[PDB]
Each structure stands twice: as C-alpha cells, then as structure tokens.
Specification:
With 541 residues, this protein is of the alpha+beta class. It has helices at 23-30, 40-53, 63-67, 83-87, 91-106, 143-165, 175-188, 202-205, 208-218, 225-239, 265-284, 307-323, 367-378, 385-392, 397-414, 437-445, 457-470, 475-491, 494-503; strands spanning 4-6, 16-17, 114-118, 122-123, 137-141, 192-198, 242-245, 251-255, 287-294, 297-303, 346-352, 358-364, 421-424, 429-432, 539-540. The chain binds the ligand O=C(O)/C=C/c1ccc(NC(=O)C2(NC(=O)c3ccc4c(C5CCCCC5)c5n(c4c3)CC(=O)Nc3ccccc3-5)CCCC2)cc1 and the ligand CNC(=O)c1c(-c2ccc(F)cc2)oc2cc(NS(C)(=O)=O)c(OC(C)C)cc12.
Length: 541
C-alpha cells in the first residue's frame, strides 16, 4: 500500500530554516508503495521479543498524571482549550479528555483526524556537497488524544522497550554509559567490525502490519481492560494510519505509515528497527552481534569474518532489511576502527584526562549545533537547543570553548544565571537551571569531562574549520572570553563559583583541583535515561 495518498491541497504554513515551501519535495520522497516479505528469522525474533514483553505489567495513568506530562507550549486543542488549561486541570480540558477516552473505549474503527505540518528546522547553508534539505513533515493528533495516549501507553513506552531489547535499547544510557557500552562491546570482539545502517525514509517504510506487530508486543503486557481497549482502538484508528488535515483545516491526504507525532513513534520505531535488524543479522549470518538501536538509528558491532566475507555479509543484511521493507539510504560500510562509525550524527573520539589516562567520548560536527545556537539567540525561542548541546556534548572541545563560554557570558550580562530554561533534549522537554550544569555534567559524563585535553588533530581541525566557515571568532578568542567569564563566576561564590571552577578549568594555566561535586548525587535524574519520547509530547520539570 502507499505510505501516503494526496488530495492536491497544500501542506500550508503553521543560516536557513526549513519551511512549507519545500514540503512538496519531501512529499515526493516519502510517498511510495511498500513491499514486505517476512520469513522464519523475522518470526523467531518476534516470538523472542514477545516472550520478554510478557514479563511487563503496565499501569494506566490517571487524567492528572497524563495532564502533568503535557509540555506548557504543546499545540492547542481544536476543542477550545490549550496546554496551560490541561496542565491546570481546567474543567473544560479534563471533561474533553474524559470524553475522548470514553470514545476510544466505545468506538473501535473510526479513523482519528491528524494535522500535517512542515517542520521549521535550522541547518547550515552549505552549497558544497549537495543542496538544501526539504522540510521534514510532522503528523500529530489533537491535544485531547495526546493526553489519552499517555493514559493508555505512557507506562508501556517507558518500561517495555528495555524489558524487550535489554542492552540494545539505546535510550536507557547517559552519554557516559553509551560510550562505555560501545567501547566494551568493541573490546569484547576478537576481530571487531562495525557498521551503521541508515534506512531511507524509515517512517514511510513502517507498514500497517509493522504497526499491528508492535501492538502484538504491547498486548503481551499485563494491562487494565480499558488500557487494552484504548491500545486496540488507538492502533486501528490512529497508529496504522488515517486522514491528514492541513493548518487551514483542509483535507490533505491519507497516511498508511508511521505518524511522527504520536506517543509510540520512538518506542514503535525502536522495536520495529530492532526486530528487522536482529532478523537480518541471522539472514546475513553475522557472528556475535551487539546491536544498539535509537528509533531508526542502528549500529551493529560483530566478529569479522574477513574483508570480502564482511562485504558479502553486509550485502545479505541489506537484502534481508529490504525484504522487510527497510531499504537503506546509503549502503552500509564495514568499519574496523570504532571512531570511523557515525550514528545519530555522532562518533566516538579519544582524549586524555588530567592523569594522562585515555578517555572516550561522543562528538559530532559542530556546524548544526552552532547555527542552531546562533538562530536561537537572534530570535526569541521558547525552547533552546544550545543547553541540550552543552549537556549531551559537555566533554567536546566545541561545547566547552564556544557554547559554555558564549552562553555563560550572556547569562552573566543579563543576570539570568538563576533562571530555569525549557530545553528540548531529543524527545522529552525539561526545565533546567544553568547553575546545576556541573552536577548534571558529572552525572552524565563523569568528572573527566572537566579535564579532557590532548584532543585528536582531526577533531581540532573539524572545530577550527567550522569556526572559519561560520564567521565565528577563533579558539584563542574563546579562551580569552572564558577567562573573564570564569573570573566573574568565581567572584559570585556559591553555584556560580562551582560553574567557574569546573566548567572553565581548561581556560587557566594554574588549574584548580577538581574533586567530585558534593551536590551531584542529590540531583534527581531518575526520568532522564529511561526511554525515548521524540514526537511523544513529553515534559519533565
Ligand atoms: O584574529 C583575532 O585575533 C580575532 C578575531 C575575531 C573575529 C571575530 C570577532 N567577532 C566579534 O567580536 C563579534 N562576534 C562574535 O563575537 C561572535 C560570537 C558568536 C558567534 C556565533 C554563534 C556561536 C555559537 C553560539 C551562538 C553564537 C556565530 N557567529 C558569532 C560571532 C558569527 C555570526 O555572525 N553568526 C553565526 C551564524 C551561524 C553560526 C554561528 C554564528 C561581536 C561583535 C563583532 C562581531 C572577534 C574576534
Ligand atoms: C545507535 N546509535 C546510538 O545509540 C548513538 C551513537 C553511536 C555513535 C557511534 C557508534 F559507533 C555507535 C553509536 O552516537 C549517539 C549519540 C547520541 N547523543 S549523546 C551525545 O547525547 O549520547 C545518541 O543519543 C540519543 C539518540 C539518545 C545516540 C547515539
């Protein structure tokens, strides 16, 4: 069946930000027929996944618990209330949510309406290898339905993926634990080989049968009878597909693939990608596989069988993935150095701590993080990706020298150091105090994140080159600015002095002794690395 059918009505509007002007180019790419052929390997992996899902007991969330996970700036309902009303448990909001819930229990078939929109995402104007990327498309149901999804499935999508996939489930790890997991898996092989597998338009490759297969996994949980019906109804009325309405309320088309803006997008994609990849590992006869899956992003670390044998096994993996309706964008390449693998735009790199010990960390090309940080400072945004970047890429040369220096200088100048910020980190939105950054960094990356030095020449060159092309002052200017920020922070005492001491020890010759931060343990990060919620409309204060 077609991933999408279109009526002809346009997807109307809500360095460079993507707009609805490029939506037709994205519609062309994501529209195609899916061919799917299943085999014994697929069926065996599925049964194994279901036997693990059978150990899960999931709870139904109350209206209040579901309302309190709603982000403050979540899209307004068409039924006369917004995210603020949901969060305050207003009578209008709650009564509409209860009626949506009852309708899910009573109506098992009627397709639920969704809104289709072009995303406004910032990318950097690079006229070199290729041109601008068209806008990504977001498909989401009404606010009342989103609250109901949380009631039925929040506990499922938060608990089931780790129970089913174990150590392969990518969202359970902090950046420090992810690097450790990867390095240990790499070291455990006699002769390691690794590859990233990039599916072309993953969301469109997800068939109606794939979505029913996901439901079959959720249905293995011990569930309240209303949760069982709500999941059943949501699968048929929303998850498998449905009508698409534009921002002007016009009938836009019909979807028969994954909706990007539903609670199950991340969980469903991870489970589907994992099922297809684990079965393809068996078809390709890959030896001693370690997989790591984050939605459609997949990496396999295995035992090498030789140069030509590895090339042949990867061709067989791709053929199996293609039969499962997951063909690649670029064909996978075998890598024999862990640093050469790029997944989720990131790679593992090497540095040394204060003692000279070799430490590993995840990095990425800083162009998009810097362009996005520049965009957000230039235009007032409710969500700020720069803080997420400082947190997730804290050990990197670029997050420390540029991002920390620049934003702490702004916060000092504005006297806003104490002000909590809403920051979108991948999936879930969090309210974070910048003065808590040293404690957060220590917990996610370890104490070594404040003492890394002796970065790789290739990493240094990528940062320096990125600064030049974007018109950003060189690293020496950042060192000078960091020394002033550091001095101003220390002079303030308290948490500000802790920021000055730990975040900017790199900027001074006479270095301070960085001991474990006292505050660190008491920090509540219990809901940080549980599960993925990208497109799932999730908020944590
Ligand atoms: O050779 C030497 O010894 C010294 C050279 C040298 C070169 C340039 C400066 N620039 C400045 O002082 C100013 N800009 C900056 O001091 C500046 C700071 C951050 C900048 C950023 C981002 C970096 C990440 C955090 C958010 C801000 C961008 N651009 C920046 C410029 C350059 C810019 O204008 N825009 C973009 C566009 C895309 C991406 C990045 C940028 C402030 C007033 C005059 C311009 C200073 C010194
Ligand atoms: C499947 N792929 C992965 O899980 C990831 C790899 C990776 C890189 C090289 C490899 F060889 C293997 C994997 O790098 C990542 C970086 C981040 N960001 S971060 C800096 O916040 O950790 C990530 O976090 C999100 C998506 C939760 C997931 C991955």
């Amino acid at each position: 069946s077609m991933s999408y059918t279109w009526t002809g009505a346009l997807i109307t509007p809500c360095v460079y930000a993507t707009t609805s002007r490029s939506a037709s180019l994205r519609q062309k790419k994501v529209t195609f027929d899916r061919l799917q052929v299943l085999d014994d390997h697929y069926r065996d992996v599925l049964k194994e996944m279901k036997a693990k899902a059978s150990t899960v007991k999931a709870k139904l969330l109350s209206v209040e618990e579901a309302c309190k996970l709603t982000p403050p700036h979540s899209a307004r309902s068409k039924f006369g209330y917004g995210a603020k009303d949901v969060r305050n448990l207003s009578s209008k909001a709650v009564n509409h949510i209860r009626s949506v819930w009852k309708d899910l229990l009573e109506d098992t078939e009627t397709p639920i309406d969704t809104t289709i929109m072009a995303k406004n995402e910032v990318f950097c104007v690079q006229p070199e290898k290729g041109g601008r990327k068209p806008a990504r498309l977001i498909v989401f149901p009404d606010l009342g339905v989103r609250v109901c999804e949380k009631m039925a499935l929040y506990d499922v999508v938060s608990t089931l993926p780790q129970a089913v996939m174990g150590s392969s489930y990518g969202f359970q790890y902090s950046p420090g634990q992810r690097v450790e997991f990867l390095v240990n898996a790499w070291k455990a092989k006699k002769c390691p080989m690794g590859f990233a597998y990039d599916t072309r338009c993953f969301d469109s490759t997800v068939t109606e049968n794939d979505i029913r297969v996901e439901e079959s996994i959720y249905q293995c949980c011990d569930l309240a009878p209303e949760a069982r019906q709500a999941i059943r109804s949501l699968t048929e009325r929303l998850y498998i597909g449905g009508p698409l309405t534009n921002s002007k309320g016009q009938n836009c088309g019909y979807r028969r693939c994954r909706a990007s803006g539903v609670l199950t997008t991340s969980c469903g994609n991870t489970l589907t990608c994992y099922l297809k990849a684990a079965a393809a590992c068996r078809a390709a006869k890959l030896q001693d596989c370690t997989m790591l899956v984050c939605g459609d992003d997949l990496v396999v670390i295995c035992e090498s069988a030789g140069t030509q044998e590895d090339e042949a096994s990867l061709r067989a993996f791709t053929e199996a993935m293609t039969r499962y309706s997951a063909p690649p964008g670029d064909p996978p390449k075998p890598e024999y150095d862990l640093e050469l693998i790029t997944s989720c735009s990131s790679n593992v790199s090497v540095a040394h701590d204060a003692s000279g010990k070799r430490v590993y960390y995840l990095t990425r090309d800083p162009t998009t993080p810097l362009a996005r940080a520049a965009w957000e400072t230039a235009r007032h945004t409710p969500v700020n990706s720069w803080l997420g970047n400082i947190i997730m890429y804290a050990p990197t040369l670029w997050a420390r020298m540029i991002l920390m220096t620049h934003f702490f200088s702004i916060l000092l100048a504005q006297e806003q150091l104490e002000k909590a910020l809403d920051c979108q980190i991948y999936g879930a939105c969090y309210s974070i105090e910048p003065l808590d950054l040293p404690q957060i960094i220590q917990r996610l990356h370890g104490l070594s994140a404040f003492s890394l030095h002796s970065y790789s020449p290739g990493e240094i060159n990528r940062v320096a080159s990125c600064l030049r092309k974007l018109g950003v002052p060189p690293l020496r200017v950042w060192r000078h600015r960091a020394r002033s920020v550091r001095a101003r922070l220390l002079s303030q005492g308290g948490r500000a002095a802790t920021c000055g001491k730990y975040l900017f020890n790199w900027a001074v010759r006479t270095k301070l002794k960085l001991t474990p931060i006292p505050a660190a343990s008491q920090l509540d990060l219990s809901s940080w690395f549980v599960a993925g919620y990208s497109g799932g409309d999730i908020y944590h204060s």
